[PDB]
Amino acid sequence: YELPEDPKWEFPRDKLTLGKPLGEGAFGQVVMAEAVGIDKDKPKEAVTVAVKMLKDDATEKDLSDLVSEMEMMKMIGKHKNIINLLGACTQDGPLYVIVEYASKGNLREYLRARRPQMTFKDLVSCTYQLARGMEYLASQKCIHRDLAARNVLVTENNVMKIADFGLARDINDYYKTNGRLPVKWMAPEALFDRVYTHQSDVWSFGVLMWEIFTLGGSPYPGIPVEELFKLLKEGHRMDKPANCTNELYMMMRDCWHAVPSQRPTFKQLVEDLDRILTLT
Ligand SMILES: Nc1ncnc2c1ncn2[C@@H]1O[C@H](COP(=O)(O)OP(=O)(O)CP(=O)(O)O)[C@@H](O)[C@H]1O
Numbered sequence: 001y002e003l004p005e006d007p008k009w010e011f012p013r014d015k016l017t018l019g020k021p022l023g024e025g026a027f028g029q030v031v032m033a034e035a036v037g038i039d040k041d042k043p044k045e046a047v048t049v050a051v052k053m054l055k056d057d058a059t060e061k062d063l064s065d066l067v068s069e070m071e072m073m074k075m076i077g078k079h080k081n082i083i084n085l086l087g088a089c090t091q092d093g094p095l096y097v098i099v100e101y102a103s104k105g106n107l108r109e110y111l112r113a114r115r116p117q118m119t120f121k122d123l124v125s126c127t128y129q130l131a132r133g134m135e136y137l138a139s140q141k142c143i144h145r146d147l148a149a150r151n152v153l154v155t156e157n158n159v160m161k162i163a164d165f166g167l168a169r170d171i172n173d174y175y176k177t178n179g180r181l182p183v184k185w186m187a188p189e190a191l192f193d194r195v196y197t198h199q200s201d202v203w204s205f206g207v208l209m210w211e212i213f214t215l216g217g218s219p220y221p222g223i224p225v226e227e228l229f230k231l232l233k234e235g236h237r238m239d240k241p242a243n244c245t246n247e248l249y250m251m252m253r254d255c256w257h258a259v260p261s262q263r264p265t266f267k268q269l270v271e272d273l274d275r276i277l278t279l280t
Contacts, residue, residue: 002091003091003095005090006074006088006090009074009085009087009090010087010088010089010090010091011035011038011086011087011089011098012089013089013092013096015035015036016033016034016035016036016051016089016096016098017033017034017035017036018031018032019034020032022050024055027055027058027059027061027062027065027066028052028053028054028055028062028066029052029053029054029055030050030051030052030053031050031051032048032049032050032051032101033048033050033051033098034047034048035047035048035049035086035087035098038086038098047086048101049086049098049100049101050098050100050101050102051096051098051099052066052069052096052097052099053066053094053095053096053097054066054094054095063095065166066095066097067095069097069166070085070088070095070097072142072165072168072169073085073165075140075142075170076137076140076142077136077140079133079136079137080132080133080159081129081130081132081133081136081159081161081162082133082136082161082162083099083100083153083162083163084099084100085098085099086098086100100155100161101155102153102154102155102156102161102163103155103156104153104154104156105153105154106149106150106151106152106153106154107126107149107150107152107154107160107211107216108150108211109216110154110216111211111212111215111216112215112216114215115215115216118215120243120280121277121280123212123213123243124248124273124276124280125277126212127209127212127248127273128270128274128276128277129160130152130160130162130205131266131269131270131273133160133161134147134162134201134202134205134269135266135270137162137168137201138201138265138266141170141171142168142169142170142171143168143169143171143175143198143200143201144162144165144167144168144201144204145167145169145181145190145196145200145201145204146164146166146167146168146181146182146185146204147162147185147201147204147205147207148182148185148204148207148208149208149211149212149216151163151164167181169196171196171197173197174195174196174197175195175196175197176195176196177190177194177196179194183225183228183229184207184219184220184228185203185204185207185219186200186203186204187199187200187202187203187204187260188203188232188258189260190203191229191232197260198265198266199261199263199265202255202260202263202264202269203255203256203260203263205255205266205269206252206253206255206256206263207219209248209251209255210238210241210252213241213243213244213248214241214242214243215243217241219238220236220238235258237253237256240252247276248276251264251269251272255269
């Protein structure tokens with residue numbers, strides 16, 4: 001009933017001051033906190049952080065899931081476009097997973113709140129940053145499996161950070177999966193063949209692009225979940241967002257290629273988005 005010690009990551013409880021609630025999810029809660037000395041380069045400095053922890057109604061699975069999410073985040077190096085693990089309180093008390101704080105909340109709500117305010121370039125920038133994050137994550141041989149606007153967080157300075165590593169897996173060929181992945185963001189091979197590769201994340205990235213350019217629109221609007229399985233198999237794809245250029249639309253469509261190897265890689269998406277951003 002204990003958690004093994006990992007000194008590299010342990011943070012003293014007496015240096016953490018819990019603050020306002022940030023959000024309640026399915027299996028846990030997140031609260032703002034002040035952490036003193038969590039940056040080992042500035043040992044007396046107070047830093048605002050986010051703390052993930054169990055709720056009073058936690059299940060056994062919630063605990064093991066939170067531990068597993070922490071362990072996944074440990075394996076992922078630091079990157080500007082991902083929410084990084086800062087430390088954890090794992091001994092002699094409730095499990096606290098301490099991560100970077102993003103003051104502007106999740107991307108879906110951020111965009112929906114700025115509907116007529118975002119410029120087109122701002123949207124392309126957002127997309128570019130997220131491609132860069134995914135390129136990094138793929139380079140670390142991590143498949144996210146839950147890429148979506150609700151799982152991107154935005155910092156005070158509008159840096160886009162990929163978050164929510166609960167479903168992410170280390171594949172240092174392909175991860176083999178009743179499915180627990182949000183259906184509207186899943187590549188067909190994930191949905192039908194229980195197979196997951198970096199190219200499955202690329203499909204998800206395409207849905208994310210659609211969410212971004214529709215300023216937080218809901219995917220496959222009006223289609224009941226049970227029908228989506230059939231429609232996806234038959235080649236159904238969403239319409240071009242109004243905000244979108246031909247170039248960006250073709251990019252989304254390519255992310256939704258039926259053949260995984262025919263989708264762009266994240267490296268290719270970053271290269272293309274860099275260019276577009278530059279010419280915008
Ligand atoms: N590092 C952070 N900084 C600021 N807010 C955060 C945060 N991490 C999480 N939140 C917010 O805390 C809430 C709970 O998110 P959480 O990831 O725990 O559950 P969830 O069920 O919403 C998974 P999903 O990411 O698929 O929505 C959300 O409102 C989220 O936006």
